């Protein structure tokens, strides 16, 4: 399979990006500099990127930075930075509730939930303990925030009220996720258990105790993801093992080892792209595309820089990957799906692209 890096640094892993900027003035005579094409203008952070997400409409994308902590929003139609907004503290997680980028929620590292509207920052609230993940429930419009302590925090935007907090048996929530079809909330614990909760009522449904025969080392649930079918459930562990579960049965159907032993930072279900039975499991160094049923590796995407977050533009072959580099990386796999409408003629220049194996 052919994987193309439309945007991103193309230097050796050892060489830092800021040196390439010094080499930029010297290399300007080189023909390659003119030929290189950027997809989105200013699609870069001054030092590094934390997380990336796209608007549901597909017109807009949002990103966060290390210094000065800023919230870039990029407009796909005009291929430019819509605006940059600075935040008081480095951001841990964020959500986009509105269909457009207008209304967003950002969990900062200073224990603060910040609501940002079109005009600017609207209001800031402080949760009792530091938060590590954040998710919205669209039917009830309650914001559920994982926390270092056992209790999982709630904020109901409708009443605007902090309602009663879940009490979890184990301390430390790494990732929280909800199933759109069922509404089930799965909480990713520090211990080797994933806690499942009922959205309508205040009641525990079950525990799943993850088991790995290969390694006896302790592992922590780093990520949890639900497929749109409402049945299959994916888990990421700190040891680099991704478990896919049919929610109805306790046993794991498939266990995939990424091989590098790093924490799985994200799991993305590739239903919309076509050939529904595919999954991405993202580590610090590699995000591998493989089939949910066979377990065979389809494509492998290995950047020159560590990955913090990955995201898939719906219905297309774009992967946006938040990295430690100045330029954020964009990848294209033609076989998976067509290029987006806004990258309409990206197909034309495919021979010009880097063509990483």
């Amino acid at each position: 399979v052919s994987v193309y890096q439309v945007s991103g640094t193309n230097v050796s892993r050892s060489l830092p990006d800021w040196i390439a900027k010094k080499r930029k003035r010297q290399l300007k005579n080189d023909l390659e500099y003119q030929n290189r094409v950027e997809l989105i203008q200013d699609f870069e952070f001054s030092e590094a990127s934390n997380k990336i997400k796209v608007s549901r409409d597909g017109q807009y994308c949002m990103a966060t930075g290390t210094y000065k902590p800023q919230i870039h929003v990029y407009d796909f139609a005009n291929l430019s930075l819509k605006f940059d907004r600075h935040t008081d503290a480095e951001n841990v997680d964020f959500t986009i509730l509105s269909d457009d980028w207008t209304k967003s929620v950002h969990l900062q590292n200073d224990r603060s939930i910040q609501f940002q509207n079109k005009g600017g920052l609207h209001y800031t609230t402080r949760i009792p303990k530091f938060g590590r993940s954040l998710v919205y429930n669209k039917v009830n419009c309650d914001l559920y925030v994982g926390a270092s302590g056992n209790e999982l925090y709630r904020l109901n935007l409708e009443k605007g009220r902090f309602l009663n907090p879940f009490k979890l048996d184990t301390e430390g929530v790494n990732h929280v996720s909800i199933n759109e079809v069922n509404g089930l909330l799965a909480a990713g614990t520090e211990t080797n258990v994933v806690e499942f909760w009922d959205p309508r009522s205040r009641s525990r449904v079950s525990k799943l105790y993850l088991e790995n025969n290969i390694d006896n080392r302790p592992f922590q649930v780093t990520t949890t993801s639900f497929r749109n079918d409402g049945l299959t459930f994916a888990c990421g562990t700190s040891n680099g093992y991704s478990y896919i579960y049919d929610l109805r049965t306790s046993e794991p159907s498939i266990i995939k080892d990424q091989g590098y032993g790093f924490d799985i930072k994200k799991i993305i279900w590739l239903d919309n792209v076509g050939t529904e039975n595919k999954i991405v499991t993202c580590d610090k160094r590699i995000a591998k595309i493989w089939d949910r049923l066979d377990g065979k590796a389809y494509a492998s995407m290995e950047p020159s820089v560590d990955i913090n977050d990955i995201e898939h533009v719906p219905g297309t072959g774009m992967f946006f990957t938040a990295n430690e580099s100045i330029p954020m990386h964009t990848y294209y796999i033609p076989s998976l799906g067509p290029s987006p409408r806004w990258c309409s003629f990206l197909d034309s220049i495919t021979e010009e692209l880097e063509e990483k194996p």
């Binding site: 050796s12 050892s14 060489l15 040196i19 010094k22």
Partner: protein, 208 residues
């Protein structure tokens, strides 16, 4: 020398081995540019072990990345360090490059730190190749005739140029002794007899 890099096959030239030996020296030249062209021509010789570590050798020849490259490339037990099987082929090319940087005069604060870094990577190296550095330093010194005869100095060898060469050699040894200290490898041919040879000149010079 930038043409010799452009030769499609430098191996099948009329005299490749002897050319490689002269390219072997130009890689040890003080001028970092001459090393770059020399390394480029040395790589026209296709060799898989050299090809694997291609980028690192440039990071050494580049001045800006020199300090960072040493800490990553030459540190023992490092993740990116050379593999044991490739030490024999690669680390020779390491020998001259740092030898060239040591040749660079310490005329600036940056250069003085550069010289210190060149001597500080010696402990990472295993002893036989530490001797190879000390041999390269003493190769220019022509001392075999002195010990071959009854320890007599030739008038022709007694020149201002020659004294400069021992002064460079002795200074490198002193810096190496400061770093390696008790772990310093001591050999008659590589270091001791050039060292004694240099002293014999200073006495022959200061009297004559």
């Amino acid at each position: 020398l930038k043409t010799l890099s452009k030769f499609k096959n430098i191996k099948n030239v009329y005299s490749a081995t002897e050319l490689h030996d002269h390219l072997m020296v130009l890689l040890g030249s003080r001028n970092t540019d001459v090393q770059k062209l020399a390394l480029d021509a040395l790589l026209a010789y296709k060799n898989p072990t050299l090809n694997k570590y291609r980028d690192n050798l440039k990071n050494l020849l580049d001045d800006t990345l020199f300090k960072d490259e040493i800490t990553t490339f030459l540190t023992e037990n490092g993740s990116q360090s050379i593999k044991a099987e490739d030490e024999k082929v690669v680390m020779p090319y390491v020998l001259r490059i740092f030898f060239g940087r040591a040749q660079v005069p310490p005329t600036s604060g940056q250069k003085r730190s550069r010289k210190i870094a060149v001597i500080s990577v010696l402990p990472n190296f295993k002893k036989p190749y530490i001797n190879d550095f000390l041999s390269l330093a003493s190769e220019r010194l022509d001392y075999n005739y002195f010990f071959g005869n009854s320890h007599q100095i030739n008038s022709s060898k007694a020149t201002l140029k020659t004294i400069r060469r021992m002064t460079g050699f002795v200074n490198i040894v002193n810096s190496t002794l400061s770093v390696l200290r008790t772990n310093f490898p001591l050999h008659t041919n590589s270091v001791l007899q050039p060292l004694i040879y240099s002293i014999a000149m200073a006495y022959y010079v200061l009297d004559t």
